[PDB]
Amino acid sequence: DWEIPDGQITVGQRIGSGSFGTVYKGKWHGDVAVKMLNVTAPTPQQLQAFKNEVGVLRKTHHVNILLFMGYSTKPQLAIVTQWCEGSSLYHHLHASETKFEMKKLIDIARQTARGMDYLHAKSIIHRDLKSNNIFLHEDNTVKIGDFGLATVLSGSILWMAPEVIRMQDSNPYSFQSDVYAFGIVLYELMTGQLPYSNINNRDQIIEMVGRGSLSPDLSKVRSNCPKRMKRLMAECLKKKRDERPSFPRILAEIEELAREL
Numbered sequence: 071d072w073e074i075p076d077g078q079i080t081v082g083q084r085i086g087s088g089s090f091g092t093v094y095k096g097k098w099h100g101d102v103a104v105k106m107l108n109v110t111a112p113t114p115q116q117l118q119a120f121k122n123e124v125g126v127l128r129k130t131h132h133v134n135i136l137l138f139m140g141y142s143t144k145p146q147l148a149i150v151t152q153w154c155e156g157s158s159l160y161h162h163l164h165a166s167e168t169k170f171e172m173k174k175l176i177d178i179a180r181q182t183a184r185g186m187d188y189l190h191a192k193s194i195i196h197r198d199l200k201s202n203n204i205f206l207h208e209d210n211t212v213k214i215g216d217f218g219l220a221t222v223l224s225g226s227i228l229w230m231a232p233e234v235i236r237m238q239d240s241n242p243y244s245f246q247s248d249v250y251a252f253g254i255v256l257y258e259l260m261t262g263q264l265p266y267s268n269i270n271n272r273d274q275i276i277e278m279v280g281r282g283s284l285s286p287d288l289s290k291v292r293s294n295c296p297k298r299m300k301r302l303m304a305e306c307l308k309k310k311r312d313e314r315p316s317f318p319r320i321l322a323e324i325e326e327l328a329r330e331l
């Protein structure tokens with residue numbers, strides 16, 4: 071079993087949430103990230119369900135994917151991954167002052183696309199892709215997280231597709247809805263802002279994005295943004311999930327764009 075024995079893992083600096091739990095800067099002589107799952111009294115049923123999904127994290131291994139190091143049962147259900155010293159992409163873009171050149175802006179997008187391309191190759195739908203789950207490792211490598219517990223909403227609707235928002239299906243999520251979320255990530259990178267800064271009401275954004283009368287303002291992108299990047303971003307943000315490009319052709323046009331400039 072991959073189960074880390076009790077006591078070997080300790081938590082310290084709290085980061086926050088953290089879908090299906092709470093993440094910490096943990097430790098076992100080597101900085102690791104610990105997600106403390108919100109499960110009080112584990113019944114042997116959901117303990118097995120968590121066991122099986124851990125079994126998935128075992129063989130889902132990629133360079134732009136958060137490395138799964140192990141899990142815990144006692145004293146609390148925890149997911150242990152590697153620690154990214156460069157924090158998350160949301161922090162650098164919206165929470166701090168960091169001179170981001172277009173050079174590495176596009177590169178962050180390229181690594182994020184490949185990480186998502188692998189997840190879709192492994193037939194995994196992320197469902198939570200945002201700049202909060204994009205972590206910058208100290209070796210200047212983008213790491214995607216919060217994709218676990220796939221076979222098992224709050225409270226970030228900025229990255230949610232119009233068809234996901236409404237919603238109409240019990241399972242509205244698809245590979246194409248992951249693309250839209252990536253399209254917002256692209257928007258954050260190029261503009262340097264979260265979408266819908268003008269509108270404050272969360273209830274109104276729900277109504278308007280679902281309606282189709284509210285879209286990210288592509289005008290607020292930086293002047294040094296390549297034009298091929300902009301309309302690619304526009305294709306990812308299209309309302310109908312049918313017309314959205316797949317990650318294979320997303321990754322294709324981005325990496326070929328990097329060698330043009």
Ligand SMILES: CCCS(=O)(=O)Nc1ccc(F)c(C(=O)c2c[nH]c3ncc(-c4ccc(Cl)cc4)cc23)c1F
Nearest residue numbers: 093103104105136138153154157158161215216217218
């Ligand atoms: C294999 C993947 C398992 S998963 O359940 O699907 N995903 C999963 C599992 C456990 C986690 F602890 C995390 C997670 O959140 C982080 C993982 N490494 C990090 N490094 C820095 C920050 C950070 C540092 C500083 C700021 Cl200011 C913000 C964030 C956040 C994380 C995670 F995304």
